[PDB]
Scaffold this active site. Structure first.
Site, short mmCIF file in Angstrom:
data_model
loop_
_atom_site.label_atom_id
_atom_site.label_comp_id
_atom_site.label_asym_id
_atom_site.label_seq_id
_atom_site.Cartn_x
_atom_site.Cartn_y
_atom_site.Cartn_z
N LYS A 94 7.11 1.23 3.49
CA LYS A 94 8.06 0.26 2.97
C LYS A 94 9.49 0.79 2.75
O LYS A 94 10.45 0.04 2.92
CB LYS A 94 7.50 -0.39 1.69
N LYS A 121 10.28 9.76 -6.85
CA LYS A 121 10.84 10.50 -5.72
C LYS A 121 12.04 9.64 -5.36
O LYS A 121 11.90 8.43 -5.17
CB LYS A 121 9.87 10.51 -4.54
N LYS A 166 0.82 -1.20 0.00
CA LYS A 166 0.00 0.00 0.00
C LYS A 166 0.86 1.25 0.00
O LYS A 166 1.97 1.25 0.53
CB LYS A 166 -0.88 -0.01 1.26
N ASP A 219 2.00 2.42 -5.81
CA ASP A 219 1.05 2.26 -6.90
C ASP A 219 1.67 1.64 -8.15
O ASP A 219 2.14 2.35 -9.04
CB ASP A 219 0.44 3.62 -7.27
N1 LIG Z 1 6.84 1.81 12.35
C1 LIG Z 1 6.71 3.15 12.11
N2 LIG Z 1 6.61 4.00 13.17
C2 LIG Z 1 6.48 5.31 12.96
N3 LIG Z 1 6.44 5.92 11.76
C3 LIG Z 1 6.54 5.07 10.70
C4 LIG Z 1 6.68 3.72 10.77
N4 LIG Z 1 6.75 3.21 9.47
C5 LIG Z 1 6.66 4.23 8.70
N5 LIG Z 1 6.52 5.36 9.37
C6 LIG Z 1 6.32 6.77 8.82
O1 LIG Z 1 5.42 6.86 7.71
C7 LIG Z 1 5.99 7.68 6.60
C8 LIG Z 1 5.90 6.87 5.33
O2 LIG Z 1 6.88 5.81 5.29
P1 LIG Z 1 7.59 5.45 3.89
O3 LIG Z 1 8.81 4.62 4.17
O4 LIG Z 1 7.73 6.62 3.01
O5 LIG Z 1 6.53 4.42 3.24
P2 LIG Z 1 6.30 4.09 1.74
O6 LIG Z 1 7.66 3.47 1.34
O7 LIG Z 1 5.13 3.11 1.63
O8 LIG Z 1 6.08 5.44 1.26
C9 LIG Z 1 7.41 8.10 7.06
O9 LIG Z 1 7.49 9.54 7.20
C10 LIG Z 1 7.64 7.48 8.49
O10 LIG Z 1 7.79 8.49 9.53
N1 LIG Z 2 -8.84 10.21 10.17
C1 LIG Z 2 -8.51 8.88 10.11
N2 LIG Z 2 -8.48 8.17 11.27
C2 LIG Z 2 -8.17 6.87 11.25
N3 LIG Z 2 -7.85 6.14 10.16
C3 LIG Z 2 -7.88 6.86 8.99
C4 LIG Z 2 -8.19 8.18 8.87
N4 LIG Z 2 -8.11 8.53 7.52
C5 LIG Z 2 -7.77 7.45 6.90
N5 LIG Z 2 -7.62 6.43 7.72
C6 LIG Z 2 -7.17 5.00 7.37
O1 LIG Z 2 -6.13 4.92 6.40
C7 LIG Z 2 -6.43 3.87 5.35
C8 LIG Z 2 -5.95 4.33 3.97
O2 LIG Z 2 -6.42 5.65 3.57
P1 LIG Z 2 -7.02 5.90 2.09
O3 LIG Z 2 -8.33 6.60 2.25
O4 LIG Z 2 -7.00 4.70 1.24
O5 LIG Z 2 -6.02 7.04 1.50
P2 LIG Z 2 -5.28 7.13 0.14
O6 LIG Z 2 -6.48 7.47 -0.78
O7 LIG Z 2 -4.26 8.25 0.21
O8 LIG Z 2 -4.75 5.77 0.01
C9 LIG Z 2 -7.93 3.59 5.49
O9 LIG Z 2 -8.18 2.16 5.38
C10 LIG Z 2 -8.31 4.06 6.96
O10 LIG Z 2 -8.32 2.97 7.94
F1 ALF Z 3 -2.31 4.15 -2.11
AL1 ALF Z 3 -3.31 5.55 -2.64
F2 ALF Z 3 -4.35 6.94 -2.99
F3 ALF Z 3 -4.71 4.48 -2.70
F4 ALF Z 3 -2.03 6.73 -2.50
F1 ALF Z 4 3.92 4.09 -1.90
AL1 ALF Z 4 5.02 5.42 -1.55
F2 ALF Z 4 6.22 6.61 -1.12
F3 ALF Z 4 3.75 6.53 -0.97
F4 ALF Z 4 6.29 4.29 -1.99
MG LIG Z 5 -6.91 6.28 -2.64
MG LIG Z 6 8.59 4.66 -0.81
#
Ligand SMILES: Nc1ncnc2c1ncn2[C@@H]1O[C@H](COP(=O)(O)OP(=O)(O)O)[C@@H](O)[C@H]1O
Ligand SMILES: Nc1ncnc2c1ncn2[C@@H]1O[C@H](COP(=O)(O)OP(=O)(O)O)[C@@H](O)[C@H]1O
Ligand code: ALF
Ligand code: ALF
Ligand SMILES: [Mg+2]
Ligand SMILES: [Mg+2]
Ligand code: CFM
Ligand code: CLF
Ligand code: SF4
Ligand SMILES: [Ca+2]
EC number: 1.18.6.1
Lengths: 274, 522, 478, 274
Positions: free
Chosen positions: D15, D41, D10, D129
C-alpha cells in the site's frame, strides 16, 4: 530440550504460513510443538487446526469474566501431527489495544504452565508491525531464546528486517535472546538471494534458508492445511523439511548488528541491480 | 462581617443573613435549578426499592467505589523495607495522588518517587526515564534499595521493567549490585491489595529465587509473617508483641510501622526501621511462613510454597476470638512454644468484656464494607458477639471469597439475614441502608456521605457510621488503633458498644419526651 | 540575606545531582530582583520534571477534572478509565457548593467507568455509551455530563467525542469529552488549557443566538475562583455590595447555566490567571468582553482591586465602592491591631501551584510578615514576570522544586513559617517548623475578601505562636 | 475540492508503494497532493522525497520539548511533482506505543491547519496491522471520507481485507467515511482477479483496479523513486495512471458488508481452485 523461538518480520512476508509449514515438518520428525499466536487476527493456527480457531484467550477471558477464571483446556487445542495451538486473540481492527492482550495472554500461558515439560519447541508467531512493548512480550526474559526474521529481497522488507533488528538489541543486551538468522521467503525479485545474504552478513547473522515462492502453498492454504499435509511429495514440501532441519541444528545465535539507512541504500544499489 | 473577638470560619459564617440573602439571589437569578419540590421528589425516589432495582442493574457505571488501584498497594509494601524508596515507573500524577492519599490517613510524610513519563515517553517508551530516574533517585535520596512498580500507562504500552533496569545497570546508571526489585502493577486489574501482593512477591523473588541452593527449611528457627496491606499501626505491633510474648522467633516481612510513626523531635527522617535485606535473603531458612491476610496474598503464597518449600498454614486473619485462638495454636505447633499464661489471661479478659456487653450488642444489625480479609474478620467477630451483619459489601472481592464468607455466615444462626455483595459500590450500599435499614454501618470515611443521606430522609432513618477501615480522613489518629488479636477485638468491641450507647443517649436526651429512658447506669 | 549568599546556597544544593539533572535544575532556581520585567533571563518554567527527583506536580487530569470541571455543581463528571484517579481525587479539593448531593448536585461524588482488562483490550466506547444511559436513569436531575479521560483512554484511542456527539443528540444533553490524559503536558497546567478549550468547544456557545436574558450595565463574571472554603462567596458579597451583579462564578459553586450566560456580561474578573486566561482571551476576541486580573487576598490588595474594578464603571459604582471600603475598614483594622503584633517580622517560605505563590504575599505583609521565598509547581513565565514585582529583592525563587531542594533550602533559610501542600506538611512539622496548608487552607474558613482576612490572620497566629513548637526537644537532651 | 482518502490492507501488500506511485501519477495530472504517513517506520514518502524522511512529527516534537512547540515547516517537506509529505513517526519495534504516536501526529496536523485550503488530495498511508484505536484516527469524523483497501488473491490477504472491513463499519456508521473499493495488487495467485471481484461483490464494493506484479516497481524503488519518474514509458507506469483516474472519477462509496469466516472459506473454494 524445550526450545522457544519467536518469528518476526515485514508485514505479510509469510511468517504465519512458513511457521505452520515448518512446524508440520517438525512434527513429521517426531518433535512435540506448540505454536503461540500473538496477533489480533487469530490466524496463526488455521493450517494446523484445519480451521480458524475461535477459542482465543482474550475472547474466552472476556466471557469467563477474567483471565483468572480461564483454563488451559478451553483455549489449547491439538491439531495436525499432534501440534498444540493457542491464540492470543484481540479486538477487531481500529479499536482497543491488541498489545495488552498479548501481554495478558502470554502471562496466562506462563502461569497455567502450558509450556509443558515434554515439548521440544514452542513458536511465538508475532504480527509484522511490532508497534509496542506488548508485541515484544515473546522475547522478554525466560521466553524465546532464539529469533528468526523472515524477509525477502524487497527493499521495504529488508528495511523492516533491519529495523526489527534494532528493536531486538534492548532485549538481547538485557537478556539471553539471540538472533538465530534470516529466513528468505522469496518473492521473485532480482538477485534476491545475494541481497538477503549480504544483509545477513552485515547484521552478523546468516540466511538460514531460502524458501521458494510456490503457488502450491496457496492451494494447500485454500484447503486449510500445510503443504506437508496437502501434498507430501511436493517439491515445496521438501523445502520446509530442509528449513526444519536447519532450525533444529542451528547453533549460530548472535546479537543483531543494525546498519544505518545509508548503509542499507548502498547495499541495495550494489546487490540489487541486474 | 467579623467580630475580631469571635472570628467565624466558613461553617458559622455563611449562615449570617447577608450571606443567605446573597446565595438566595445567586440561585434564583442564574442557576436555573430545579424547584425544591422536584428535588425532594427525586430524593425520596432514590430511597425506594424501585430505585434500588434500577441501581443494581448497572453494568457500566460505578458510583463511589470502595477500592483503589494496584500501585497504591505496591508503595505501602515498599515502605516496609529498610531504607527503601518506592519508585513508580509511569506518570507523575499518580505518585502525587498515592502520597497525598496516604498523607491524609497516616498524617505522616510519605516518600515516593516517579520517573515522570510524558507524551513522548508514552510514544517512544520509558527506558531513558528509567535510566536517568534510577540514577537521580539514588544520588539524591540515597536509599539502599529502590522498589519499582507501575502506573497504568506503562502497563498498557508494555514497558519492560526487567529489561530497562538490567540495561540501566549495564550502562552504568546504577551499580550492578544495587537492589532494584520490581513488579507489574496494572491499575485495571484487581485493586490496591493486589498491588501489595505483586510488589511483595517481586521483592521476595529478587532476593531469593537465584540463591535457593544453600537454603534449608527451619534452619534459622524463625517464623516469617507477611502482614499484607495493613493501615493500622497497632496491627503490626500487636503481632510482634504476641510472638515475643510466646518467646517465638519471628521475621516480619515488610514492616512500615516505624516510617509511618516517626517522632517529631526537630529532625525529619525519610527512612526508619523496616524489614532488612538480610532478613529477606534469609527468609527461606524459616520454619514456615504465615500469611496474615490470605485473600490478597495469593501470588505470594504460590511463590513461597513453590520456591521456599514452606507448608503455609491455612489460617484466616487473626481477628475475633476463634481466629486469634487458631492463629496462636498454629504458631505454637510450628514453633514448639506453648501458649503462655500471659496470652491465656488476655483471652479471658476479652471473653469477660463480651459477657459484660452482650445485652447491648445482641441483635444489632450492621452494614459493612472494606477489603476481603478485614471484612471477613469483622463478620466473624460480629457473629461471635451475637450481632447481625445484614449487608456485607466487598467491592474488590471475588467469587471464592464470597463462598467462604457465606460458609462462615451459615455456620451461625446470626448470619441468617446476611447477604454478601461483590463488585458493588457505595451507591449500591446506599440503597441497601434505605430499603433494609441496619442500626449502624461499619466502614471508612466515605460512609459519612451515606449517613448524611439517610438523616436527610429523617432522624428515625439515620444510620450512624462507625469508622473502622481504610482510609479514615475525618477523624484524628485512628490509624494507631488495633483490630488484630485479642487486643484488637477489645478495641473493636469497645467501639461498637459505646457507639450503640452514644446513639441511645442521643435518642433519649429529650426532656419530658424521651428522657424517661436516659439512665445514668447502662 | 544578600543574593551572594543565596546564589551560593543554590549551588551548594545542586552539588548532589548527577550532571544532567544538575544543569537542568539550575535553570529553575533564582534570586529575585525587582527590576527585571522579563523573567526568562532569571528562571525557566513549564518544562518537564526530571525523573526520580520526587516533584510535587500533578497531572493534566487533576488539572481538568480536579480543578476546572469537578467544581461544577449540576453536571456529572465521569472519570473515564481505571478506578483510581477518581478515587484519589474524590472530595480532596474543598471547592464548596450549595446543593442536594446525589440528586441535583454531584461535586462530592466519584463516577467512573472502572476499566478492567477487557475494557483496555477491547475498547470502552460501548461501555461509555451504556454508562451514559445508566447515568440518565439514576440521576435524572443532572444538567449535563463530562467525561474526563484518564491515561489509558489517551493511548488506545477511544473515540469519546463521537460517543459524546451521538449520545448527546439522542438524550438532548450536553456531553463534554475532555482529552485530559494524565501523561499529556508536564503538570496540572495543560489540563487547565484542555479544560478551557472543552468549555469553549462544547458549552460556551450554547446561547449565542438567545437574547431572552435581561442584562444590565453592571453585569460581571468572576472566573478563576474555585470557592476554596467559600473564597468565592466572600468575594461575591463584596462585588455585589458595591453594586455589581455577578452573573456567574467559574467552577466554584458554579452551574452549567451560569457558564452559558457568561458571554452576556460586561466584564470578566479573573482571579486565577493561570487556569482561566485561555477562556478569558477567547471571550474577548469572540464576544468583545474585556477581562482584568484582581486580587482579594488581604485588605490592601482587596481595596486596590475594588477601586480598579469600580473604575471600569460609572460614578454610582465608584461611590458604592468607597462605601464598601468604609464599612470594612474598622473590621480589618481591628484584625491587624490584634494579630500584627503577634506576627510582625516573622519570615515565610511558600510553594504552591500557579497563583497563590504570588497572590497571598500582600496579606502576609498586611500582618507585617515577610515572604523570604516563593515558588510554583507549574507556573509559566508570564506568571514569574508578575512575581518579581511582588517579591522583595534578594529573595529566593524556585520552579517545580524537588523534595531534597525544598528541605535543604528550609534548613539554611530557617523561616518562621512555611505555606505549602499536604505532601510537605508533615516533613516540616517534624523539623519543628510551623506549617500552614496554602491549598486547602488546612480545612479553615475562607481567606478571600475582608471576612477571610480575619480567619487568615487567626490561622497564621494560631499555628506560628502555638506552644507545641517549644516542646520538640526532650528536656534530657541538650 | 479537497478529498481525503485513507489506505488500508494486509501487511506488506504494497500500500505504501502503490500509494506513492498513484500519487506521482496524480501530480503528473496537475493535482496538488499531500501524503500523511501513519506508520512507526517513516517509509511512506521515500519514493517521493527520494530519501528516508528524518523529520517525523514525533521525533521533532521530542526535540522541541512538546508537540506544542512544534511547527509545520519543520516536518512538512515537498518532493517529486511538488507532492507534500509528512510522517507521524514512532518508536523502534518492540517498545513505546506507535498508536499514540499517530494520535498525536494527526492531532498536531489538524491544529496546525496543514490540511491547507488548495490541496486536491490528501492520502493517509496506514500500516497493515490496525491493532488499535490510534490507527483508525484517519477515519474519524471530518478526516478521510473514502477508504481504499489494497489486497491480492491470497487467502490471508482477503481475510485481512474482510477483517479491516468489520473495523470500518463502526467509523462508517458514526461518521461519513465510506469504502471506495478494493485495489488488487497482484501477487500471481491462481484466478486472482476472480477471487477479488468475488470478495468485492460480497462486501458490496468494487475492485477499483488490478495492479500487475512488475519487477520494474522494485528497480525504481531501489533508486528511491516511483515508476512514473523512473520510467514514464514503462507499461506499469500506465497501470498507475489508470488507477489514478479510476480514483479521481470514483463514485461508489459504501458501508462494508463483512462476511463470516465460513462464507469466506466457501468463497475461496469456489473461485480459488484451478
Ligand atoms: N506491483 C508490485 N510489483 C512489484 N513489487 C511490488 C509491487 N507492490 C509492492 N511491491 C513490493 O513489495 C514491498 C512492500 O510494499 P509496501 O509499499 O511496503 O507495502 P505495505 O505498504 O503494505 O508495506 C516493496 O518492497 C515493493 O518492492
Ligand atoms: N513460499 C510461499 N509461496 C507462495 N505463497 C506464499 C508463500 N509463503 C507465504 N505465501 C502467501 O502469502 C500470504 C500471506 O502470508 P502470511 O503467512 O499471512 O504471513 P504474515 O504472517 O507475515 O502475514 C499467504 O496467504 C500465502 O498465499
Ligand atoms: F499482516 Al501479518 F503477520 F499477518 F504481518
Ligand atoms: F503493513 Al506494512 F509496511 F508491512 F504498512
Ligand atoms: Mg501472520
Ligand atoms: Mg507501509
Ligand atoms: S495547586 Fe492555584 S493555579 Fe490552580 S488546586 Fe493551587 S495555587 Fe491548584 S488558584 Fe487554584 S484553587 Fe488550587 S490550591 Fe489557580 S486553580 S491547579 Mo491546589
Ligand atoms: S497520571 Fe493522572 S492520576 Fe495517574 S493514571 Fe494518569 S490521569 Fe490518573 Fe489512575 S488508575 Fe491508578 S492513579 Fe495512576 S495507576 Fe492509573
Ligand atoms: S500501539 Fe500497542 S500499546 Fe499502543 S494502543 Fe496500540 S496495541 Fe496498545
Ligand atoms: Ca504525624
Amino acid at each position: 530440550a524445550m526450545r522457544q523461538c519467536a518469528i518476526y518480520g515485514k508485514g505479510g512476508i509469510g511468517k504465519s504460513t512458513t511457521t505452520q509449514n515448518l512446524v508440520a515438518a517438525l512434527a513429521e520428525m517426531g518433535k512435540k510443538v506448540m505454536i503461540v499466536g500473538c496477533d489480533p487476527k487469530a490466524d496463526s493456527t488455521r493450517l494446523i487446526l484445519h480451521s480458524k480457531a475461535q477459542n482465543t484467550i482474550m475472547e474466552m477471558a472476556a466471557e469467563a469474566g477474567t483471565v483468572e477464571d480461564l483454563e488451559l483446556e478451553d483455549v489449547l487445542k491439538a491439531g495436525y501431527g499432534g501440534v498444540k495451538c493457542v491464540e492470543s486473540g484481540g479486538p477487531e481492527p481500529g479499536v482497543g489495544c491488541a498489545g495488552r492482550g498479548v501481554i495478558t495472554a502470554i502471562n496466562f500461558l506462563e502461569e497455567e504452565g502450558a509450556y509443558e515439560d515434554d515439548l521440544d519447541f514452542v513458536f511465538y508467531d508475532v504480527l509484522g508491525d511490532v508497534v509496542c512493548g506488548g508485541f515484544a512480550m515473546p522475547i522478554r526474559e525466560n521466553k524465546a531464546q532464539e529469533i528468526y526474521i523472515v524477509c525477502s529481497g524487497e527493499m521495504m522488507a529488508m528495511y523492516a528486517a533491519n529495523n526489527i533488528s534494532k528493536g531486538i538489541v534492548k532485549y538481547a543486551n538485557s537478556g539471553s535472546v539471540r538472533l538465530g538468522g534470516l529466513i528468505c521467503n522469496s518473492r521473485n525479485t532480482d538477485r534476491e538471494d545475494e541481497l538477503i545474504i549480504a544483509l545477513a552478513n552485515k547484521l552478523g547473522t546468516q540466511m538460514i534458508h531460502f524458501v521458494p515462492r510456490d503457488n502450491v502453498v496457496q492451494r494447500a492454504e485454500i484447503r486449510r492445511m500445510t503443504v506437508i499435509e496437502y501434498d507430501p511429495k511436493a517439491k515445496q514440501a521438501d523445502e520446509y523439511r530442509a528449513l526444519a532441519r536447519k532450525v533444529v541444528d542451528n547453533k549460530l545465535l548472535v546479537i543483531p548488528n543494525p546498519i544505518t539507512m545509508d548503509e542499507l541504500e548502498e547495499l541495495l544499489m550494489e546487490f540489487g541491480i541486474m | 462581617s467579623q467580630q475580631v473577638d469571635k472570628i467565624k470560619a466558613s461553617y458559622p459564617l455563611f449562615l449570617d443573613q447577608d450571606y443567605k440573602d446573597m446565595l438566595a439571589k445567586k440561585r434564583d437569578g442564574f442557576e436555573e435549578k430545579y424547584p425544591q419540590d422536584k428535588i425532594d421528589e427525586v430524593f425520596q425516589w432514590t430511597t425506594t426499592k424501585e430505585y434500588q432495582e434500577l441501581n443494581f442493574q448497572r453494568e457500566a457505571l460505578t458510583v463511589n467505589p470502595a477500592k483503589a488501584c494496584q500501585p497504591l498497594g505496591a508503595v505501602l509494601c515498599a515502605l516496609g523495607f529498610e531504607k527503601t524508596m518506592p519508585y513508580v515507573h509511569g506518570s507523575q500524577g499518580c505518585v502525587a495522588y498515592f502520597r497525598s492519599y496516604f498523607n491524609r490517613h497516616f498524617r505522616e510524610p510519605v516518600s515516593c518517587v516517579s520517573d515522570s513519563m510524558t507524551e513522548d515517553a508514552a510514544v517512544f517508551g520509558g527506558q531513558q526515564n528509567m535510566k536517568d530516574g534510577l540514577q537521580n533517585c539514588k544520588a539524591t535520596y540515597k536509599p539502599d534499595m529502590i522498589a519499582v512498580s507501575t502506573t497504568c500507562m506503562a502497563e498498557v504500552i508494555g514497558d519492560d521493567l526487567n529489561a530497562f533496569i538490567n540495561n540501566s545497570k549495564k550502562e552504568g546508571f546504577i551499580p550492578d549490585e544495587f537492589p532494584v526489585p520490581f513488579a507489574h502493577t496494572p491499575s485495571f486489574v484487581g485493586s490496591h491489595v493486589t498491588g501489595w501482593d505483586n510488589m511483595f512477591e517481586g521483592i521476595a523473588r529478587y532476593f531469593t529465587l537465584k540463591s535457593m541452593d544453600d537454603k534449608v527449611v527451619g534452619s534459622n528457627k524463625k517464623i516469617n509473617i507477611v502482614p499484607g496491606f495493613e493501615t493500622y499501626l497497632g496491627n503490626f505491633r500487636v503481632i510482634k508483641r504476641m510472638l515475643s510474648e510466646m518467646g517465638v522467633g519471628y521475621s516480619l516481612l515488610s514492616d512500615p510501622e516505624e516510617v509511618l510513626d516517626t517522632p517529631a523531635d526537630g529532625q525529619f527522617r525519610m527512612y526508619a526501621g523496616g524489614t532488612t535485606q538480610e532478613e529477606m535473603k534469609d527468609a527461606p531458612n524459616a520454619l514456615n511462613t504465615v500469611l496474615l491476610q490470605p485473600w490478597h496474598l495469593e501470588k505470594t503464597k504460590k511463590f513461597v510454597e513453590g520456591t521456599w518449600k514452606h507448608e503455609v498454614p491455612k489460617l484466616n486473619i487473626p481477628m475475633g476470638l476463634d481466629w486469634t485462638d487458631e492463629f496462636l495454636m498454629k504458631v505454637s505447633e510450628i514453633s514448639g512454644q506453648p501458649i503462655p499464661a500471659s496470652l491465656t489471661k488476655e483471652r479471658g479478659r476479652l471473653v469477660d468484656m463480651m459477657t459484660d456487653s452482650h445485652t447491648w450488642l445482641h441483635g444489632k444489625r450492621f452494614a459493612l464494607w472494606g477489603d476481603p480479609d478485614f471484612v471477613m474478620g469483622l463478620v466473624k467477630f460480629l457473629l461471635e458477639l451475637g450481632c447481625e451483619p445484614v449487608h456485607i459489601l466487598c467491592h474488590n472481592g471475588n467469587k471464592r471469597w464470597k463462598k467462604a464468607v457465606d460458609a462462615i455466615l451459615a455456620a451461625s444462626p446470626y448470619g441468617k439475614n446476611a447477604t454478601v455483595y461483590i463488585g458493588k459500590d457505595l451507591w449500591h450500599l446506599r440503597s441497601l441502608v434505605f430499603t433494609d435499614k441496619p442500626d449502624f454501618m461499619i466502614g471508612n470515611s466515605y460512609g459519612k456521605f451515606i449517613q448524611r443521606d439517610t438523616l436527610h430522609k429523617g432522624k428515625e432513618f439515620e444510620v450512624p457510621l462507625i469508622r473502622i477501615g481504610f482510609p479514615i480522613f475525618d477523624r484524628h489518629h485512628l490509624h494507631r488503633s488495633t483490630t488484630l488479636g485479642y487486643e484488637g477485638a477489645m478495641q473493636i468491641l469497645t467501639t461498637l458498644v459505646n457507639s450503640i450507647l452514644e446513639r441511645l443517649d442521643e435518642e433519649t436526651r429529650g426532656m419530658q419526651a424521651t428522657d424517661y429512658n436516659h439512665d445514668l447506669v447502662r | 540575606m544578600s543574593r551572594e549568599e543565596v546564589e551560593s546556597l543554590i549551588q551548594e544544593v545542586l552539588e548532589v545531582y548527577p550532571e544532567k539533572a544538575r544543569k537542568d535544575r539550575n535553570k529553575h532556581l533564582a534570586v529575585n530582583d525587582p527590576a527585571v520585567t522579563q523573567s526568562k533571563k532569571c528562571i525557566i518554567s513549564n518544562k518537564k520534571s526530571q525523573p526520580g527527583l520526587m516533584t510535587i506536580r500533578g497531572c493534566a487530569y487533576a488539572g481538568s477534572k480536579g480543578v476546572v470541571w469537578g467544581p461544577i455543581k449540576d453536571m456529572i463528571h465521569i472519570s473515564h478509565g481505571p478506578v483510581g484517579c477518581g478515587q484519589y481525587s474524590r472530595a480532596g479539593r474543598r471547592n464548596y457548593y450549595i446543593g442536594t448531593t446525589g440528586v441535583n448536585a454531584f461535586v462530592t461524588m466519584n463516577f467512573t467507568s472502572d476499566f478492567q482488562e477487557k475494557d483496555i483490550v477491547f475498547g470502552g466506547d460501548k461501555k461509555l455509551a451504556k454508562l451514559i444511559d445508566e447515568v440518565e436513569t439514576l440521576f435524572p436531575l443532572n444538567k449535563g455530563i463530562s467525561v474526563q479521560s484518564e491515561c489509558p483512554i489517551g493511548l488506545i484511542g477511544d473515540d469519546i467525542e463521537s460517543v459524546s456527539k451521538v449520545k448527546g443528540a439522542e438524550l438532548s444533553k450536553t456531553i463534554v469529552p475532555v482529552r485530559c490524559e494524565g501523561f499529556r503536558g508536564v503538570s496540572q497546567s495543560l489540563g487547565h488549557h484542555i479544560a478551557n478549550d472543552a468549555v469553549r468547544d462544547w458549552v460556551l456557545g450554547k446561547r449565542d443566538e438567545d437574547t431572552t436574558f435581561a442584562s444590565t450595565p453592571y453585569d460581571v463574571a468572576i472566573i478563576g475562583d474555585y470557592n476554596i472554603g467559600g473564597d468565592a462567596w466572600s468575594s461575591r458579597i463584596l462585588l455585589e455590595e458595591m453594586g455589581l451583579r455577578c452573573v456567574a462564578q467559574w467552577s466554584g459553586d458554579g452551574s452549567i447555566s451560569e457558564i452559558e450566560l457568561t458571554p452576556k456580561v460586561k466584564l470578566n474578573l479573573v482571579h486565577c490567571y493561570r487556569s482561566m486566561n485561555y477562556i478569558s482571551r477567547h471571550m474577548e476576541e469572540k464576544y468583545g468582553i474585556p477581562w482584568m486580573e484582581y486580587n482579594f487576598f488581604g485588605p490592601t490588595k482587596t481595596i486596590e482591586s475594588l477601586r480598579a474594578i469600580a473604575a471600569k464603571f460609572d460614578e454610582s459604582i465608584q461611590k458604592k465602592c468607597e462605601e464598601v471600603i468604609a464599612k470594612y475598614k474598622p473590621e480589618w483594622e481591628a484584625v491587624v491591631a490584634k494579630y500584627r503584633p503577634r506576627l510582625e517580622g516573622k519570615r515565610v517560605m511558600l510553594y504552591i501551584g500557579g497563583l497563590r505563590p504570588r497572590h497571598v504575599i500582600g496579606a502576609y505583609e498586611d500582618l507585617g510578615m515577610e515572604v523570604v521565598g516563593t515558588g510554583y509547581e507549574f507556573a509559566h513565565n508570564d506568571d514569574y514576570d508578575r512575581t518579581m514585582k511582588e517579591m522583595g529583592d534578594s529573595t529566593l525563587l524556585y520552579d517545580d522544586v524537588t523534595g531534597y531542594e525544598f528541605e535543604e533550602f528550609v534548613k539554611r533559610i530557617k523561616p518562621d513559617l512555611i505555606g505549602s501542600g499536604i505532601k510537605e506538611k508533615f516533613i516540616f512539622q517534624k523539623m519543628g517548623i510551623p506549617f500552614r496548608e496554602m491549598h486547602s487552607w488546612d480545612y479553615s474558613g475562607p481567606y478571600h475578601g475582608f471576612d477571610g482576612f480575619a480567619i487568615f490572620a487567626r490561622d497564621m497566629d494560631m499555628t506560628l505562636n502555638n506552644p507545641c513548637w517549644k516542646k520538640l526537644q526532650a528536656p534530657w537532651e541538650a
